[PDB]
Paper text:
However, in Xanthomonas campestris and some other bacteria, these reactions are catalyzed by a single bifunctional N-acetylglutamate synthase/kinase (NAGS/K), which has been proposed to have evolved from the fusion of ancestral NAGK and N-acetyltransferase. We have now succeeded in solving the structures of two NAGS/K enzymes, from Maricaulus maris (mmNAGS/K) and X. campestris (xcNAGS/K) that have substantially higher sequence similarity to vertebrate NAGS. In both crystals and solution, ngNAGS is consistently hexameric, while mmNAGS/K and xcNAGS/K, as determined herein, are tetrameric. Each mmNAGS/K subunit has two domains, the AAK domain (residues 1–290) and the NAT domain (residues 292–441) connected by a hinge residue, Gly291.
As noted in Methods, crystals of mmNAGS/K were obtained in trigonal space group P3121, hexagonal space group P6222 and orthorhombic space group P212121. Cell parameters for the trigonal crystal form of mmNAGS/K are a = b = 95.1, c = 253.0 Å and β = 120°, consistent with two subunits per asymmetric unit and 42% solvent content. Even though this crystal form diffracts to only 4.3 Å resolution, the structural solution in space group P3121 could be found by molecular replacement using the A–X dimer of the P212121 crystal form as the search model. Packing analysis indicates that the 2-fold symmetry axis of the molecular tetramer is aligned with the 2-fold crystallographic axis perpendicular to the plane of the tetramer ring. The tetrameric structures of the other two crystal forms (space groups: P6222 and P3121) are similar.
Author numbering:
A (entry chain A), D (entry chain A): 5 to 440
B (entry chain X), C (entry chain X): 5 to 439
Write the structure that this text describes.
């Protein structure tokens, strides 16, 4: 194994979008090599675009990553079994495939599966086709739904055989009960059980839609279940469809570490989505709630002082928290990220902003900032010249002001005359953390 | 992938027998994806010698060849883990595995199967494990034999997915009826159906035995079903066992092109057997019958002169064939191997013996010799000292005689005084090929 | 050899900064055998960090580049094994090694040298150790300094024998007078003579220090001898040490083509320094003086429009240059980097700033900025929000102002109220490049 | 290291001339990798045939072998220093190179050396040029011979650096005294000291002559110093030249294990010489004396019975050695190989022929056979049908006779009538070793 990595990495060291690939490699250097990625795909894409999914899969595996790919044959089977016939039966709320449809789906996927594995190989990747035997599942209903079952135990045995070898495990979605009765698993129950078993770092659904949509119909650049979910279920414009995947993605992530994430995208924007700070697709985390409030008394000072000591590096001076006045407060449920407003000549003033190393990487330091600006469109703050984080402040503000030691910033459509006054004030505020 | 294929020629280009690999392999340009090779193995070898088969399979695939390997779990299943949980195997005709044994064989082979695929990768080969879903088979008997079935249709779909990628398709021996009923195919019916479907160039069973035996117990260097089979079934020393595989191998080849062949061997002699003109193991063809004749006139001279020019390397001098007298003639149907007797002072005398490089390797040069000695127990012939073949002549004869240039031989329980005369004649006979 | 060269492109073809290696390397198609790179190192690094230099050298050579490395044994010889047998080094001008120290330095470097070549091979590189016989040198002083000499003629014969084979020629720092008298060249005179002989494109000293320092003690991101040198010698904070290497590096480059450049760095920042437009270490060129002017007329417009089309990517609108008013103009001699001031309400205003990709990497875009600020302590300019350069503008300014599309900047100790006016002007100024 | 071998060997397994290359590889698998081969070369070959030596060297190294090559510049310097001048001085009995010739030979060889290393690389091999620093040597005479010295200690340090890397160490023949005085070593003293230090298995001198000559002028297919040497020094036709190399080669081998050998040949016959059982060049061993005699009483029976028990596998029946009559006896000094003649109806009869496994491989079983036939041109013997050694008997005889169990052979221009009688006798002789 330590053979392909070294160079594939001495590569990744110098690039614009490199720092965030070599490290996946090191993390899953070994053993959790498949713990890299799960990836679902609706029947359509593989059919109408056999070639793009394929071009994609071969980049992850060559980089050291390991897609463990799963596919259904929505459209090729959905339509191919009507050519044949006896296609209708969807008993409870989803598809019943009675004894007659068994041989079709085998033969179809298996056809396609290879089509995909070979499509994968065509693209320069390495992969193993693993189209039977992954899902042990119990058939739970004999009469009604016909011949459909449920994932009870997972033989990861096979995937690892492909992966260990640097192959993308291309699991199709069929299964065998443990006595052998071949069964059709609708792929979602499959993906879960699977994501469960594997604990990948990322899980993606490839569709032709290739992004998800807001009220205005634009692509959705991230969700945060932790906060967003309830609302999100509960809006009309959110069409029937969009409430359920969200149900399911919350479980998928509710059952993985948070360190996990998710996109849903079209193959073409696949590149821009995993490794950049904008992108084109939906990434979904569970992320964490933010706690708000104007009520300095509802917050844990012992604990926040405990938050602060770790982010920056100093403890607040004595008698300080008592003295703080305070306008509005944002603490994410775990007291590892927080934002605080005092006031000044009417201007909302950012007093302290502290995000622990773990929180920034989860992309949380960043949700925080967001309720803070939704609430304060006109905002002033200051900052040490070296706080290497200054750069994010310049990217976001509509104002700046630098002296040797300190730099006062502002964010709002104000003209400097106005600003100069509170700003002058801002340079004058004293240091809140002790000495240099 | 970069370093592999290349660092295989400018490697085997600095040695003596490099032309025979390029020439059997290039001639083995039956890529046809996987139409390369089928390969049975008895349960035993994988167990007691996981490592050998494995070392072997990795040479074919890196060379450009493509073993499509298949395996049962004879001993590992026969014994341990079937005897462990004390289930026990029930035989009616051959083995009945009733509903109880299903989970064991899956779980056992599947174990071992990966054991082998990983054994394969351990050895530096590329392979895919294809341990379920190749054999669609019908369970034909419900009550009696329990849960056992029969190959009706073959999804080569899988093998080609491994092979196409340069993987040794390592199909283990289980199957699914088309409705799904998991079933135990006893491997033979599997291999046939399979070899049927595939039409490989070569098909080899691997066993501990690693060779097959004659009357005297020595390894058997080739058979020729075409001629040998009838007798071969019909000899007592030929033990019960040895009659049937021959029954089956006749079918396997009877159902493949003749261009096909077959070894049965232990991993260790696998090297010497495929690509050399001696070897160590059993190669089996169907070959062709030879018809026996004294009739110079019933033979194709234009064509034999065509056979001779290729074996040795000179053409017969003018007016020769017409001149040739001829006591008796053996040509294998294809005019690529032949043996000819003239006469001399009563002694049957080998005049010419030519077997083309292809025929030698098929083990046919060698059937030819056989009717020739069944017919002439007392025999004389001669030969050049360098004809590197000489060794075989000395292994066989019961006489020799060497002078710098030529060497007269004889094969018969005669005392030199008798012999000396025809022999002296033998040295005297002139060269039949030019300078 | 098969797997190496190839598994280097379809590898660095699936990443963002792959064009800059292909483009500095292909542009670095100064194979000229070894005319690739020279590389000094102080005794220390090889000792305390045998492994780093080593990890480094193996990247150049596998890439197609060819480090011709040279080494002294500063610390290993200075201390241990010279202090061990208690000989001790005698300095008159710099170091005298009288007859007694000969065997030590041979034996020491030669040790270490292999240590490095093997360190090199450990790292997956290819190299040849070339630890005697490169420096033919004359011992000029017999009595005083003891046994020390001077490089008169260079046998590159050896280096090319290692390099031609894809070996990092690892010349250690000993020499033989032409009659044979083994001699200790203090390495500098060696490196010069050597860089002289070789004409590499780049030449780098490796030290623990791994960067060079300014007044404030920060790493120095580039010098420009052409302009900087005089001042540079002539500053007190510039400590004794820092004046001389600069003396020597001026000569080294004064004697190479300008196309040459130079880092001085610690192994760890070696990556970021050669192939990026920021980096971490000292790059030194001779660069060229800039002459200072307010005379629009003394500048080559056809040629500047030629400079501008390349940096940004649009051409100026018609009748423009004629229109341009112009307070002051900085063009580096080569018309590949330039800065221009118009005016506005009294404020010097940066109108255009264009540095071609080549100039940036030479660290020249950056000298330019320098006379521009020495001249205009109070300065205003503007900029697109995306011009990925913006960051440098924010690192420098003492003012900013952002709106969706554009961003007005300023650099001076002014209070926003003053500024707001010219700034409001700044946002108002129209685009100078088309759409 | 275990990287290049495996395949380079799975290669060598099937060939006509293969069994005798893979094993050199295994022997010198590691560590004694340079203990593979030394190789000298006269100035001429590298000049007039830069390309052949070169084509040669690259086959050994690619096969796993490791030539450690040494060269002088006989002709290119011999002639190039007369262009210059002051070329004459050969003080004792060989060449004096006074202070003036130092810079020439450096500069010449070093030129050529690289020429050879590059010639080596041109040929597809891997090599390192190691043209200074191998020979530490003392200059022993200051005034007379000018500036020439003598090999006192050997830094093998360098060779191993090339070899370890799979390079053919191409040592040129210059040296440095330990204080540094550059000196010219005439290459022979160099080769010895070197062969000494290295203990290679084979050592070869490449010349344009490319073989050595007998009385009749034909190429000499092997010598055996052990026996041949005294005579060999002592024959007139043996010209002045041919007595001395033989002096030197005896020392070279007298100071290496016997397991060693030697050819002297032209590059073109280099292929046929190391790996076949004829060849074209001279191979030289020390080999071992053969002891002869008709005197059964001068031989060690306890010991021969000790020889016999190991070769075949049986001990002679009781009272046997006493009974043996005996015509002529050949024992090589070490009692590990022997040949014995009794008589029968006048015909010299080979009674026992036993060569221990070690002796056959030294090629000694084979010298033995040779005095035995020089002495008995008409010879009869017999042999078991399976004694796998039968084949050598057929290659050599001018007669045969096979029955199921035994086979009677003869060697001589006799007609079978004559022979049949002693032969009939031969089949009738009883087994000398006990039962099957």
């Amino acid at each position: 194994a330590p053979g392909v990595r070294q160079t594939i990495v001495q590569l990744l060291s110098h690039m614009r979008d490199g720092k965030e690939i070599r490290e996946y490699l090191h993390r899953f250097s070994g053993i959790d090599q498949e713990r890299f990625a799960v990836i679902k795909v609706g029947g359509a894409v593989i059919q109408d675009d056999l070639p793009g999914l394929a071009s994609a899969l071969a980049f992850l595996q060559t980089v050291g990553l390991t897609p463990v790919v799963v596919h259904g044959g929505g459209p090729q089977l959905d339509a191919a079994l009507e050519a044949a016939d006896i296609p209708t039966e969807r008993v409870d709320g989803l598809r019943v495939t009675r004894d007659e449809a068994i041989p079709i789906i085998r033969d179809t996927l298996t056809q396609a599966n290879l089509a995909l594995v070979d499509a994968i190989r065509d693209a320069g990747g390495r992969a193993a086709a693993v189209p039977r035997g992954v899902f042990e599942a119990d058939i739970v209903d004999a009469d009604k739904l016909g011949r459909v079952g449920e994932p009870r135990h997972i033989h990861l045995d096979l995937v690892g055989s492909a992966a260990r070898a640097g192959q993308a495990a291309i699991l199709a979605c069929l299964g065998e009960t443990p006595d052998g009765t071949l069964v059709n698993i609708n792929a979602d129950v499959a993906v879960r059980a699977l994501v469960h078993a594997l604990q990948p770092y990322k899980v993606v659904f490839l569709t032709g839609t290739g992004g998800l949509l807001d009220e205005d119909g634009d692509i959705l650049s991230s969700i945060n279940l932790a906060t967003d979910f309830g609302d999100l279920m509960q809006a009309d414009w959110v069409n029937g469809g969009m409430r359920l995947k969200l149900e399911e993605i919350k479980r998928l992530l509710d059952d993985l570490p948070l360190s996990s994430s998710v996109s849903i995208t079209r193959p073409s924007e696949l590149a821009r989505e995993l490794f950049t700070h904008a992108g084109s697709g939906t990434l979904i985390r569970r992320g964490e709630r933010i706690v708000a409030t104007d009520d300095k008394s509802s917050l844990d000072l012992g604990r926040l002082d405990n938050l602060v000591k770790a982010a920056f590096g100093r403890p607040a001076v004595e008698g300080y928290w008592d003295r703080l006045r305070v306008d509005r407060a944002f603490v994410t449920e775990s007291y590892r990220a927080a934002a605080i407003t005092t006031r000044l000549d009417g201007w909302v003033y950012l007093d302290k902003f502290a995000v622990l190393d773990d929180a920034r990487g989860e992309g949380l330091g960043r949700t925080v900032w967001n309720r803070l600006v939704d609430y304060a469109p006109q905002l002033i703050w200051r900052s040490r010249t070296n706080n290497p984080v200054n750069g994010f402040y310049f990217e976001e503000c509509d104002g700046a002001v630098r002296r040797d030691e300190w730099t006062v910033f502002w964010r709002g459509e104000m003209g400097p005359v106005e600003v100069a006054d509170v700003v002058e004030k801002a340079f004058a505020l004293p240091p809140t953390l002790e000495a240099p």
